[PDB]
Each structure stands twice: as structure tokens, then as C-alpha cells.
Design a protein around this ligand. Sequence first.
Ligand SMILES: *[C@H](O)[C@H](C[C@@H]1CCNC1=O)NC(=O)[C@H](CC(C)C)NC(=O)OCc1ccccc1
Ligand SMILES: *[C@H](O)[C@H](C[C@@H]1CCNC1=O)NC(=O)[C@H](CC(C)C)NC(=O)OCc1ccccc1
Lengths: 305, 305
Amino acid sequence: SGFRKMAFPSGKVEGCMVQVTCGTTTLNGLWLDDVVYCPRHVICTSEDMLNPNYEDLLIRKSNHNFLVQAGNVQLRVIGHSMQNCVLKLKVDTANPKTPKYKFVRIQPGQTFSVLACYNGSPSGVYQCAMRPNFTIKGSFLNGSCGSVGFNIDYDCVSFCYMAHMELPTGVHAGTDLEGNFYGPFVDRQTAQAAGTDTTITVNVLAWLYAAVINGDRWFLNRFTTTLNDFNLVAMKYNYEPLTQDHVDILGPLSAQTGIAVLDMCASLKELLQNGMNGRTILGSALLEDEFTPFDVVRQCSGVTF
Amino acid sequence: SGFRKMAFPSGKVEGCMVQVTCGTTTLNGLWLDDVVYCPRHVICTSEDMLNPNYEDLLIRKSNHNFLVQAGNVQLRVIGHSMQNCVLKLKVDTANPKTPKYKFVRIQPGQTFSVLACYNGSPSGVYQCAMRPNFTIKGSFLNGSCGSVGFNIDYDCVSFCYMAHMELPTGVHAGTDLEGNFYGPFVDRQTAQAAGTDTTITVNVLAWLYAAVINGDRWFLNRFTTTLNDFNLVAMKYNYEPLTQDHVDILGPLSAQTGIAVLDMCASLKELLQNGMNGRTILGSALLEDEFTPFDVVRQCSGVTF
Ligand SMILES: *[C@H](O)[C@H](C[C@@H]1CCNC1=O)NC(=O)[C@H](CC(C)C)NC(=O)OCc1ccccc1
Ligand SMILES: *[C@H](O)[C@H](C[C@@H]1CCNC1=O)NC(=O)[C@H](CC(C)C)NC(=O)OCc1ccccc1
């Protein structure tokens, strides 16, 4: 029993992290096959970040201006190109630790593990979720750019995120591994505000099912509700509108616990209207929304990789 | 910026996890050099667990009754011995992935990362802390025994925990890697109650310093207090008594934030007496006590391994 915020084993990703230096700027890169992926602002100085013209900045950059280092061994850069906001550095040696991998762009509400790195060296691993405003609540200091988020399917590593920047509200933003930012953000040292921090309703419900599985059941009320009525109460507390697809996804957890999805929505509705009265649910005094229905099933079943 | 519950990279430990089968029972083991460490109750059946006599049960167990499997390759068992509550299986092949390692028994209040495994395969990684009642709040299903907790010092993996059992209150208990249980617990299928769940006061204070570093500062009051006066209020809320050593350990964080330790204690005292008024601190509606002063410094500085 027990339920914990759990990240994937980071071993397969640690073997792909390198250090990319371009002048004064040093950040992390991802060495897959004979390609190194890193944020394109590695070519910016302490002044160009306000309004960088990456096409012009890349003109006076040659293959030899990129220092790619894996541990204490250097990789020879034989080619480079800019794909959106990521830089692809063609090296001459294929990474011997390259695992089976995919490039996947995730949707808001999906979760992934982040391997925070500095100078091409892993610092730690923690679980995240793509917010509805396309940001992530992470832990990133200077030099952490290039750290990647990933999911693991058995033996296939699914790369979905790369850290690029922090927003003025202490929240972070990045791109997928094809260089396209999540959301309306740009790799620019400007004032970019994020939208309203919406709560992932289907994830709260899946987390409530996890609590029922693990003994926490005081919040189970004697009420039920409808989808439209719940969404009227959810829209005032900045909750994602619940859809019929979300109900279907919660199907497995509903059948396993004998508690209908709409009955669980009524329990959430009361927790939103009455609070938690100082009580806790799975050791949390607040409603957690960073477990997908899939994370709950995986953790409660013992799925390995 | 940002502060997250962060576990060490699990890569160095994934390469040491094996599957140990003894009859019907299957659990995980730790392959270091030519030794495999696993809980001794791998030799118990579904009935002996109530009152096992491990000396007698081990008499009719031979080297060949232990099936150690690393992936799809088997290790030949050439010797076995019982050291307290762990079994040491002498194999003929040294693990080629053995990292620099230590066997360290940690104290209550220290933190470590757990690599939850099933059938010798890693499932996930999460950060824990040794509770003052010598339990841990983890996520363990059937077949997870043998999973280990660890800290990493640069390139040295410090092994400190091995999962053995769950207590009737959904909390977990285990031993160090020399077989000695943490606390008064025994590897027995009996009713073993845990003590009062005390909060690690020095860890709450270190976490409050982290909040001040990361912008959360509404809880900073205009008060101060003394050590004795704080402990009078802390003993009623089941908080660990604060000592002068704890003050010294918080020295680095105090000097970095310009906030004296006793001033921070006064802010905690008010949070204990008045609550958090529905507000949050680093995204938590409850006081977190699973960050040591060292975890805070490490995460806020960018220490790599
Ligand atoms: C990359 O290492 C670095 C990581 C930041 C710094 C601390 N946490 C992070 O996520 N990011 C940058 O250097 C980036 C440069 C590009 C925008 C070209 N700028 C940045 O992220 O600064 C943070 C910030 C930006 C705008 C307003 C307030 C803060
Ligand atoms: C080892 O795989 C297993 C892990 C338990 C089961 C789910 N979470 C855990 O931590 N532990 C055992 O099989 C163990 C056997 C030894 C005590 C010989 N027994 C156990 O942990 O059962 C849990 C329990 C014990 C006593 C009261 C209530 C529950």
C-alpha cells in the first residue's frame, strides 16, 4: 500500500546527457545516435537574449564553435542545423548508450519525469505535468537548460520536453524535441505572462481513486451529480471542464473501486465547496492533480520497465 | 527558481537490481561485487510468515535453491549466509556495473531515494525520509521487498535502506544493508504498531528557508523566540525538540537569507498556532518535513553527481 509522487528510473536518460558550450554559455544537450539536441540560445551572450535574431547569430557560428563534452571525452561536431528553437549538432560518434526512443509531443494534463542536469551531469529526477497553460512547475537554476522530460514504455524512452526558460512567476516553459514551444512562449528575455493556472480535473479524480484504494475514504459522500452540474461548480474554482472522454479514461479505476465516476465527482464538488476541514488525503492537505489515471493504475499495479 | 521533491538519479542503482526466487517467493536483490543482498524472508512460504524460525528454515535450503536472475541471465550461487535479517548470496560473477558504494546506517530525519522494484526490474524512484518512529512513508506492493534506499555522494552510492514489510497503518519498515532493522520491528507477520508520527522540526525550518529563497515569504512575521519557548509549543504539536546542533546545521541557510534561526522558529510557531489560513507554501498547504538542510542547499546550488 501507499501512494507516492513517483518518477521513472532515469538510468536510460543519464547516458544521453552531454555538456554543450558555445562561448561563455554552457548548458546541457541530449546525445541520441549521432545527434545532440540542445536549446538554440546556447549561441546567445549575456546581452543578445533581450531580442535575439537567431538566424543572424547562427551565421558566425561554425561546427568548431560548439564544444560537446560527454564526461571527460569530447565529441567532434561535423554538422549543425537549427530546427525551430532547438539546435541539432551532428557529431561523428553515435552514443553507445542510445536507448529505444521516440519524439512525442504530449497534451496538457499528461505527466512526465524531468532529469535536472547541470554541466551535462544529472542532479536529480522528479515528476512533472504539462499544465493547461502549457507551463511546468519545476526546479531549474542557471545552466539547467537542455534538461529533458520523458516517459518510459517498457524499454522505450519517450522524450517530450526540453527546458528553455523560466517565466517571471517562478514557473518554467520549454519545447518538445522538435523545437516547438509548448504554448505561446518564445525563447526571449522579455515579459511573457502565463494564463490562469487551471487544475486538471481528471487527474484529481484519479488521485481520489488512489486514495480510496489506499485506505483514505473519509471524503466519500452519499451524493451523486451530473457532468453539466459538476462543470458549473468546477468552472468557478478554475477546474478543467470534465468530458465524456475523461469519464471513459477513469473507467478502469471506477470498475476497480465500485465507485461510479459521477459519484466521485460529487465527492470532489463537496471538497471544493466545503474544503478539507484541516484533514489530509494521502498525506496532502491540498487536492493533487499531477497523477494521470494511468500513473495511478501503473503505481497500484506494479508496472516495471 | 522553484523547489521540488527531488530524488537522486537512480541509474547507478538500476544496474545492481536482480531477481531472487526461493520456491514460490520472489523478491528483489542487490548485486554488489560477487554478493547479492536480499531479505531473509525470501525463504518463507505463505504460512511460515506468522512465526518463522529462520535458523530452522535455512537448514533445508541449499545454494541451488536460490534463483538469482539479472535480466535474462542467471547467476550461479556458490555460497549463502544469513546476517541478521538479510541474506547474502555468494555468486561466481562480480557485477560489472558495481559502482563505488558504502553501507551507511542513517539517523532519524535523514532523507534518501527509494528505487521501487518488482521481479528485479525498476518501477520508479521517489524521495523518502527516515521518520522519528523509524518508519518510512513509501509505495510498496507485493514483490517489492529488496528495493533499496540510497544517497549519492558525487560518484559514491551510499546504501542505507532495504524494504522488508508493511505495517498495519500503511507505513513501511525495513533494515540497513547489514540486516539490522530500523527501530524495534521484526520480519514477522504479527501486529507491530508504530510510535507517534513526530515531525522533523529542523527539516520544516530548512524547507521554510527554501520558500524564502523561492519568493514565498508571506509567513515571515515580525517576531522572535527562544529555543526553550519554541520547544514548549513544538512538543504539543508532536514536533521534534530543536537542539543547538539543529541551529548550527541551519547556519548556512540562515546566513544566506539574513533571517536568524530563532526568528524563523517564531514564524513556524505562529504557523503551528494559527495554521496557514488556506494559503500555500511552495505549492503545499501543509508543512513539509522531508527536506534536510542539506537537500535544500543541494537543490538551490545545483550540486551534480
Ligand atoms: C537556461 O539555463 C536558463 C534557465 C532559467 C534560469 C533559472 N531557471 C530557468 O529556467 N534559461 C535562460 O537563460 C533563458 C534564456 C532564453 C530566454 C534565451 N532566460 C530565462 O529563462 O530567464 C528567466 C526569466 C525570463 C524572463 C523573466 C523572468 C525570468
Ligand atoms: C515484500 O515483498 C512484502 C512487501 C509488503 C507487501 C505490500 N507492501 C509491503 O511493504 N512484505 C512481506 O511479504 C512481509 C513478510 C515478512 C514480514 C516476513 N509481510 C508484510 O509486509 O505484510 C504487510 C503487513 C504486515 C503486518 C500487518 C499488516 C500488513
